[PDB]
Design a binder for this molecule. Sequence first.
Ligand SMILES: Nc1ncnc2c1ncn2[C@@H]1O[C@H](COP(=O)(O)OP(=O)(O)OC[C@H]2O[C@@H]([n+]3cccc(C(=O)O)c3)[C@H](O)[C@@H]2O)[C@@H](O)[C@H]1O
Ligand SMILES: Nc1ncnc2c1ncn2[C@@H]1O[C@H](COP(=O)(O)OP(=O)(O)OC[C@H]2O[C@@H]([n+]3cccc(C(=O)O)c3)[C@H](O)[C@@H]2O)[C@@H](O)[C@H]1O
Ligand SMILES: *CC(=O)CC[C@H](N)C(=O)O
Ligand SMILES: *CC(=O)CC[C@H](N)C(=O)O
Ligand SMILES: *CC(=O)CC[C@H](N)C(=O)O
Lengths: 651, 339, 657
Amino acid sequence: SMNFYSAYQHGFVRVAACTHHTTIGDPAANAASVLDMARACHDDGAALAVFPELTLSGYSIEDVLLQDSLLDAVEDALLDLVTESADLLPVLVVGAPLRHRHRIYNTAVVIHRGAVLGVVPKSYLPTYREFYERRQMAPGDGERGTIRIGGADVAFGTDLLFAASDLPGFVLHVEICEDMFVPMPPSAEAALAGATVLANLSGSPITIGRAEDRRLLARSASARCLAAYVYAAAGEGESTTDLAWDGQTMIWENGALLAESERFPKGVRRSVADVDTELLRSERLRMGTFDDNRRHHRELTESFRRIDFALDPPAGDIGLLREVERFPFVPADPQRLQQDCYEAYNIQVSGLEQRLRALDYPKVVIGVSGGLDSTHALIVATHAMDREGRPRSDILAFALPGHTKNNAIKLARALGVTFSEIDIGDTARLMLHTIGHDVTFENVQAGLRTDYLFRIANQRGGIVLGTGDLSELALGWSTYGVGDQMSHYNVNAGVPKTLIQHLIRWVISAGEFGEKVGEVLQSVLDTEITAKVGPFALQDFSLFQVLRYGFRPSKIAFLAWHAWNDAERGNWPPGFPKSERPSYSLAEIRHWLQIFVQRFYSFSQFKRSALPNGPKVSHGGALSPRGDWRAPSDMSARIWLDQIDREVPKG
Amino acid sequence: MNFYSAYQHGFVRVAACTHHTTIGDPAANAASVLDMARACHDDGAALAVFPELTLSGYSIEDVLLQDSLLDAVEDALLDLVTESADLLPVLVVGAPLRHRHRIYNTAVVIHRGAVLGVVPKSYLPTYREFYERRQMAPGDGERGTIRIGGADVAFGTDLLFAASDLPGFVLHVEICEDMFVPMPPSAEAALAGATVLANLSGSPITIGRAEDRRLLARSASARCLAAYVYAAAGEGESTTDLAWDGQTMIWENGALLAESERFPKGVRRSVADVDTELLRSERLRMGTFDDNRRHHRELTESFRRIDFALDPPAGDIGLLREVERFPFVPADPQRLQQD
Amino acid sequence: SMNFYSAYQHGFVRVAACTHHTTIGDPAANAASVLDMARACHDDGAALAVFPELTLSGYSIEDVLLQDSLLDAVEDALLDLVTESADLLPVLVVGAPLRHRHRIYNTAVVIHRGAVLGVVPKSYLPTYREFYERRQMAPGDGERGTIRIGGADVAFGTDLLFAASDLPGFVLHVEICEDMFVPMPPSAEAALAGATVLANLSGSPITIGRAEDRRLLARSASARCLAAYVYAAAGEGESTTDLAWDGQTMIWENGALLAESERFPKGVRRSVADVDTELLRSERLRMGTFDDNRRHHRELTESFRRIDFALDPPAGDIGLLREVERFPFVPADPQRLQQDCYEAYNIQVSGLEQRLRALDYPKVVIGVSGGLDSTHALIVATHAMDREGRPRSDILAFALPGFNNAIKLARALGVTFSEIDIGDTARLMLHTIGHPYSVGEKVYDVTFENVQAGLRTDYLFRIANQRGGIVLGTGDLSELALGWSTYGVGDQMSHYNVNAGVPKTLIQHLIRWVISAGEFGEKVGEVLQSVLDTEEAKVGPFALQDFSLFQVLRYGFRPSKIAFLAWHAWNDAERGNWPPGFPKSERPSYSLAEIRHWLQIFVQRFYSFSQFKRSALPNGPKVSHGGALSPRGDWRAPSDMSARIWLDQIDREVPKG
Ligand SMILES: Nc1ncnc2c1ncn2[C@@H]1O[C@H](COP(=O)(O)OP(=O)(O)OC[C@H]2O[C@@H]([n+]3cccc(C(=O)O)c3)[C@H](O)[C@@H]2O)[C@@H](O)[C@H]1O
Ligand SMILES: Nc1ncnc2c1ncn2[C@@H]1O[C@H](COP(=O)(O)OP(=O)(O)OC[C@H]2O[C@@H]([n+]3cccc(C(=O)O)c3)[C@H](O)[C@@H]2O)[C@@H](O)[C@H]1O
Ligand SMILES: *CC(=O)CC[C@H](N)C(=O)O
Ligand SMILES: *CC(=O)CC[C@H](N)C(=O)O
Ligand SMILES: *CC(=O)CC[C@H](N)C(=O)O
């Protein structure tokens, strides 16, 4: 049905921020540069191309802006670019000084397929320090109605929206430079009114620290407004009478940098990026206070003129111009990952500390298998007790038998907790014979482990620490009730499996426990990293897409297939030797995804529904029915399986 | 004149339906809705009100925010709309729908191949067992239009649906909690000229809650000189934390016309013939009704009026109404004794 | 420090609805009646006295209302009422035809301690059937400003509020008869604006069916507005030229009837009642859609004028003119209780049915002890299976003896019964754990108890896995409330809990109801009867802890409020009503000391100790309008909190005996 490989068909929109070569006072030369860059955007299958402030005239020309021949030439060049846009795909947004009523305004001219769609005046004209804009130009705020551009009255003003009738997640607002620097930017209101993609044309002469100011405000704009922010500054060609120009271009999306270009380039540059319109749709759907803010400013947000146009974007394979991280829960950037780990660890630990204070410092009872989960849980328990001034011997670690085991006893001893072994085999057998008895034997044991721990907890003034992690909660990979699903407080509940290993190796690298302790933990890593329905790399990927954005299955398959299909494309996080770096085909992704939707939406909720306490960890979510995930325990996943059948190719 | 025609005598055949909900499965909800609407059509009915969030299931919590859920809701809606081309009654069907930034708790009014309007729930309970503001936006103060499969249809809380060939039939829709607030959307709608008030309800069943539904639906109808048509969710809604009784009922000016079995096994319909002339006549005589309108002129004059033609049956289709032999002498013994 | 026995000090307000003797055309005489009834209200410590429409003239005097001497007589009778109210405690609300600008208005004069607070014209004048009010009277809808009464300009119009300054939960709004019959009543907007007590003055000539109409609309107003509604109609003395009067008076609170007087009385009558202003406060506090409605009509609601007065109510013991039931979950009225039970039962059954449909009809594993709870859950599970067309033998019931009723019921029902002796496994576990009992020591501590409790659950869960079933929860709401259960492995844990939303006090009555319906038959009836007759005294009487549960769960009332209520309900066994099924013997009274003691235990256990077991709760339906305790639903709280402030409120506010 759908062309699976089409970014557009997956709700992406391609955008370009362009920096052209300026020829100050020569609009025909500026236009030829623009047209050439636009032709490259067209070839890239871009929906949108933003150029710098006053593109057609040059920003830096001062009183030359007031010359009849300057203004006339600007107009003629403009008409030719509109004629030339008949055969171009993208909306072009080009800056121009245009006469309207008494003055010239600093405008962006929004151009698509042989017509001008609208003309947006700069709202705020800096008349301070190096800037002199009120001398030549009129402010645009409050101006409405229309402007005559080549025998056509087109919308004119700061209340304008350019909505694609065939791509409803793409709604464009345009503002100009200084417009984003003021306490109440025009783009803020345009976001509340429906704009999803915010364009900024800049001149912006460059100064020590100014690129940092542009970033601060483009970034936070994109985050606070749940939007893409597309930004172009002026470059080479501009006058250096008093200023210099760096040509910076950048594309932001909900606080995250999608693309940015070389500063001080020799020649023209572009940022091109695929903006995920569903990601924006998803954040807005969920943050109700965004809409609350709209209704508060209802008169202000309801008067925008919506201007429709049809994009007819390309339907075929044009690749994906986007970084798609293999591990949404594990950033491939080392400094970023180090920070993620520091926070995850301190979250779990402080989550436990409070519990423990509240219970007047119980013993901590914990089943330890030599596994990644219970190991890391033990560390957390230990640091918590240390921080609270509590004897590590009040941690009661139990091996509960019915290889990896050796690690458990080593770590316990290395840390100096209280270690003990209870053999559950005979209770297991008594139970099995009483019941009238593979699968079965394993349930009885897992159950009895929990049973003993809970009873030991009763006996010794303790609480049972849970050890199951987020990925297991997600998939229903636990024994429910009397089983490892149950505890008094679960420290690993909000930590996905893909992140646990990284957390342990963070603790090792911190090395604040012993050198002895580091050795046993490294051993755990080596023994353990070498639950069989899916690689957790894949199921944690899908978990993120669902928990955070509620994305559809085919949308998930596409992103994962882009992140995972080629082993040597994109980045990997640290602690991955080149022989532990796998590929997954679409068929693989599709298979594991079918299992995912079935187990996540239908099978597993009842287990999450009666969940012990524990802290949320990841911006991506947790799975607490008191927090991030309210769902029925009694629902089919037919809908999602059906979506897979119809939308995702078998190979 | 066809003497034996209920329609020609100023009656409107109205139906409140409780379907079988399959949570998170819109196509199956649309199947249960379509089946029941054909039954209504056969009965010569002019209106079929279904439960809150008919197409999704009311009780699915954050599954409401899942993209595949919403896509399937919309595809099911479009198919329902397509099927009504041949169906006599106006269908009033709940759906979670995207508009602007959020999803709304909506009722979609469907007649003969087209959508007539889309009505957001005004007040979203977010207390006790209700969590509606977490997933859904308030509809109060919303106007303008909404894009439903290639048409821009009216969207908002100020809509009236008037049968151009049956003037006593003027339809207003509100949703569950909308009738429980001091100043219901429907009280203003009646002053504006609505004679038939629909309510789609989710309404998890609790000890006493049917008495509450009763009191407010009956007192609404009496206070507003209207028929009031109520339909609650039943079997199929998630029982993770709640139970559902699928109550449906039809009031007219304080009188109960029809009601269905609570906790039924299977689908149930209340069906009743509303005397629009009764309503007309009480309105004509009670001047203080219209005085109240004039006091809230701006409120009541702003309502938008969508016209449709019913083309109801001409013939003898019986009369789904209890007409007492002695208007002055109640047949019910307890009531007669009170009198 | 408070006077614990003062209803005023617990957030009550005493309201009175009065019907007086009409002498038509004779205000001095209507005044004299009013005054006499006002003094009786004062004596009763009432803060409000509402009289019938046009109290001072007679409602039915028609064009006599246009007579100069009538109008003059009225005005002088009012000024005299006002002078007398100097020494009266209640706000008086009194009907009168009054001259303002070009006309006479059908007004309500709100009077208090020697001053008029405000005059409220009838918004809406019926001029149809037997009513002709537009002929003599002008509409009040949307008039404002002031009116001169006895040398004072006083608020006049339909947007007035009388807010008591020493009684913040008493804010009065007044309307008049037909005002409450129109789609958009004056008083609906005034409730949004902040009125807690809605007064209505009626003439209301009586007619077949009309008293039901008054009730339908005053009751639903009180319900929809989260308000008290105080209603008074004219009776004897009105003109019977074309009409008759029944002098009906009534007080509604939030949809409930507080009081009502005799219809067609010989002589004057009053409904006096204590309105709980905290019940109203708590209800408003929780239904945010009420506030959402106010913000939607912000212009309407913010326009209101607020007039203050110091009520200065009596500080002492003046009783409680209120019916406080012993069992908030168990209505004393037997047809009401029959209704609750029908509903409880069908809620439990349908909830479980849906669970079973959803899992393609698993087997049903249930631990049966012969107790009330498990007995009831078995019955519920049997009905679920029947309704779904599933064999009763797919219920797998287990007696689990540790260190007759169940087996008899199981066999009578025709379910699959089995005994599993947990003793040997308990022994083995206690030894493995090194418990003193495994070496002979009679240490019957929590672990000893829990090892057994836990093993019962462990067994059932493994049966469930082995046999393709689900374990039914058996614990009831009162146990969830107190944490009287074994957490995690044990008791507290199941695949689906049918009794989760049902409090203990309600359970026996459900069984009674099952026997009465007779649907299961003679033998089942008999065994169930037997279970009732054969069938934790350190958490206190469940009757007391359910009383406390309701106040906290529904209203969040402070502890001294709950003590007050419980004491009033439970102090004297011979006073008030009991539900069906309490033989005279089975009828305890509780002292303040008893009530206080168990409340201390409630707050500690409920707010502090027990939340953690509630926090990881299996699925099950909510049952009671009082609330349920699911952490995904009615009760969201921390698992790590102390109850210090509640225990401290008890020390300061509740006398020790
Ligand atoms: N919607 C629903 N509502 C209420 N109950 C429902 C239910 N769906 C199934 N059930 C019931 O719940 C039970 C099924 O749940 P459960 O008892 O968990 O059993 P189940 O999920 O079938 O098995 C869990 C499996 O995962 C693996 N596991 C287990 C324990 C720990 C780990 C680990 O992380 O190391 C892995 C192991 O292979 C084990 O057999 C049955 O009694 C079934 O009847
Ligand atoms: N806030 C908190 N967060 C996490 N864990 C917490 C905790 N507070 C205590 N804990 C832990 O939980 C455990 C205490 O809870 P739990 O295991 O329930 O033990 P506990 O509540 O101390 O005792 C249960 C008691 O309830 C009574 N009961 C139970 C079952 C049935 C019946 C009947 O009459 O039929 C009566 C009986 O007297 C029994 O001994 C301890 O291990 C404690 O450390
Ligand atoms: C974008 C622009 O007009 C230059 C930057 C602005 N004046 C600023 O405040 O930094
Ligand atoms: C929706 C309805 O009509 C009755 C239930 C409602 N949610 C309530 O009682 O609060
Ligand atoms: C006093 C009054 O308005 C009663 C008339 C009312 N419409 C009624 O009882 O029907």
